[PDB]
Design a protein around this motif. Structure first.
Motif, PDB file in Angstrom:
ATOM      1  N   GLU A  13      -4.997 -51.549 -22.429  1.00 26.45           N
ATOM      2  CA  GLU A  13      -5.166 -52.289 -23.692  1.00 26.45           C
ATOM      3  C   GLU A  13      -5.063 -51.353 -24.882  1.00 26.45           C
ATOM      4  OE1 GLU A  13      -6.818 -55.900 -22.385  1.00 26.45           O
ATOM      5  OE2 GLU A  13      -5.448 -54.622 -21.192  1.00 26.45           O
ATOM      6  N   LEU A  14      -5.715 -50.198 -24.765  1.00 27.64           N
ATOM      7  CA  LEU A  14      -5.685 -49.171 -25.794  1.00 27.64           C
ATOM      8  C   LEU A  14      -4.284 -48.566 -25.927  1.00 27.64           C
ATOM      9  CD1 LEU A  14      -9.045 -47.359 -24.896  1.00 27.64           C
ATOM     10  CD2 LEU A  14      -8.729 -49.014 -26.749  1.00 27.64           C
ATOM     11  N   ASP A  15      -3.469 -48.741 -24.886  1.00 30.74           N
ATOM     12  CA  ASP A  15      -2.062 -48.341 -24.918  1.00 30.74           C
ATOM     13  C   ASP A  15      -1.179 -49.523 -25.319  1.00 30.74           C
ATOM     14  OD1 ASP A  15      -0.628 -45.773 -24.399  1.00 30.74           O
ATOM     15  OD2 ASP A  15       0.579 -46.987 -23.042  1.00 30.74           O
ATOM     16  N   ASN A  16      -1.825 -50.629 -25.704  1.00 35.61           N
ATOM     17  CA  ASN A  16      -1.154 -51.881 -26.085  1.00 35.61           C
ATOM     18  C   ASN A  16      -0.297 -52.501 -24.962  1.00 35.61           C
ATOM     19  OD1 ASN A  16       1.397 -53.192 -28.075  1.00 35.61           O
ATOM     20  ND2 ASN A  16      -0.714 -53.958 -28.242  1.00 35.61           N
ATOM     21  N   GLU A  67      -7.955 -48.504 -31.466  1.00 38.80           N
ATOM     22  CA  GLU A  67      -7.433 -47.787 -30.309  1.00 38.80           C
ATOM     23  C   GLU A  67      -7.902 -46.335 -30.317  1.00 38.80           C
ATOM     24  OE1 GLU A  67      -5.700 -49.896 -32.184  1.00 38.80           O
ATOM     25  OE2 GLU A  67      -4.837 -51.359 -30.824  1.00 38.80           O
ATOM     26  N   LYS A  95       1.351 -39.327 -28.803  1.00 38.19           N
ATOM     27  CA  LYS A  95       2.218 -39.751 -27.704  1.00 38.19           C
ATOM     28  C   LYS A  95       3.594 -39.070 -27.749  1.00 38.19           C
ATOM     29  CE  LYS A  95      -0.732 -43.616 -27.375  1.00 38.19           C
ATOM     30  NZ  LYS A  95      -1.503 -44.134 -26.207  1.00 38.19           N
ATOM     31  N   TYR A 123      -3.223 -41.566 -29.414  1.00 38.00           N
ATOM     32  CA  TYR A 123      -2.437 -41.443 -30.636  1.00 38.00           C
ATOM     33  C   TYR A 123      -2.799 -40.177 -31.406  1.00 38.00           C
ATOM     34  CZ  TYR A 123      -1.431 -46.432 -29.830  1.00 38.00           C
ATOM     35  OH  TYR A 123      -1.068 -47.637 -29.279  1.00 38.00           O
ATOM     36  N   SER A 141     -10.703 -44.710 -27.555  1.00 38.44           N
ATOM     37  CA  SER A 141     -10.179 -43.648 -26.700  1.00 38.44           C
ATOM     38  C   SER A 141     -11.208 -42.524 -26.581  1.00 38.44           C
ATOM     39  CB  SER A 141      -8.848 -43.106 -27.232  1.00 38.44           C
ATOM     40  OG  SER A 141      -7.751 -43.904 -26.810  1.00 38.44           O
ATOM     41  N   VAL A 160      -8.754 -51.155 -19.378  1.00 41.65           N
ATOM     42  CA  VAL A 160      -9.184 -50.663 -20.678  1.00 41.65           C
ATOM     43  C   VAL A 160      -8.132 -49.707 -21.249  1.00 41.65           C
ATOM     44  CG1 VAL A 160     -10.908 -49.248 -21.901  1.00 41.65           C
ATOM     45  CG2 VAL A 160     -11.667 -51.014 -20.284  1.00 41.65           C
TER      46      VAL A 160
END
Lengths: 213, 213
Positions: A198-201, B185, B161, B175, B189, A195
């Motif tokens: 994915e959120l970090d791509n 995203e 980041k 982010y 998070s 998870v």
């Protein structure tokens, strides 16, 4: 891609991937200072295995799965690896992955054969039979190497809350694999890694790759 | 519960909760060294507000939501707080929470009124109009205070980041709230914080508590 450095004590020659190059001369300098103390006793793993994980590339790793040190006995140099699938920790990790994936038939599990995962031991040895007994010797080497790993991976997963108390990246501190009454907590900690990726791509880990049939 | 220390420059007196006691004499010593450089220019927030978050207890906090520094203008001393609900970051945080909770009618949002959450700015000021312009002055104070917060909270959530590159607890680096094309995203998070808390056997955050109607 493979490089080598000479050190003054056993194993005398450390081989390593290109990716580890920036830390190696500090490592050599640190290892020369402390080696005699490490080689005094019988260790897990053996001295010729201490640095075997430095052969692994880092630029293709997304996740570090980190334990405090090797198994008190029968360490291979590869963190969590148990060739005869007898060590409690890797068996419990395999169980979690079975429940997370639906795979039930298997003969073994290895974290070191999964794309994008580097399994890691914070300390690279212990005195035979005694957990964390080499904490003082590896100290600065441990910081150096962990610092370098977290420059590559997107998620650091530490196993054992009390185990880690020793010195800016996404990090989960989970329970020890052999901890009791936390089966659900253990299973879903592994699930949250993908998870967070994915959120970090980043691409998820195919944890089933670890199974040996 | 409230204590105070004298310092040699404005604001001259720093008040703080019992929980911060172990870091205060190092803080005083650090602040006395650098204050003149900080007070040379107009700052966000004003000097009398720099340390206002030290009045907040820590033993009841589970989550730190951390930005790099205050808003370039109109900082109040409370991280992310925007009394007239105009600052882009807190508006975007409020939007995420709206999508995560289903609450649509609101006039404002504040992270500082949520049980178990301490909102935090890594650097406690900036020169008016310039982001991160006081990074060098807060340096060691920032390490000291963040280190102390992570002893209490179970989850550290950093926002931005590239913002964080500056020096062992569960941590998500998300982010910046004002970042573009990452709405999904950003939303999920915030959602993973409560998941990580449950797996740590801690109570979830009621993020809707933040809303002002």
């Amino acid at each position: 891609h493979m490089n080598s450095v000479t050190v003054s004590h056993a194993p005398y020659t450390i081989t390593y991937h290109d990716d580890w190059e920036p830390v190696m001369s500090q490592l050599v300098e640190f290892y020369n200072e402390v080696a005699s103390w490490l080689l005094r006793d019988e260790t897990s793993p053996i001295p010729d295995k201490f640095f075997i994980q430095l052969k692994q590339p880092l630029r293709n790793k997304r996740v570090c799965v980190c334990g405090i040190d090797p198994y008190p006995k029968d360490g291979t140099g590869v963190p969590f690896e148990s060739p005869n699938f007898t060590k409690k920790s890797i068996k419990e990790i395999a169980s979690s992955i079975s429940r997370l994936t639906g795979v039930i038939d298997y003969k073994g599990y290895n974290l070191n054969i999964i794309d994008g995962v580097i399994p890691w031991n914070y300390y690279l040895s212990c005195k035979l039979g005694e957990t964390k007994s080499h904490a003082i010797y590896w100290d600065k080497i441990s910081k150096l190497l962990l610092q370098h790993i977290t420059k590559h991976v997107s998620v650091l997963y530490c196993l054992g809350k009390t185990d880690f108390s020793n010195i800016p990246v996404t990090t989960i501190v989970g329970y020890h694999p052999a901890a009791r009454d936390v089966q659900f907590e253990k299973d879903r900690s592994f699930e949250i890694i993908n998870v967070l990726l994915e959120l970090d791509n980043k691409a998820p880990i195919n944890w089933a790759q670890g199974f040996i049939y």
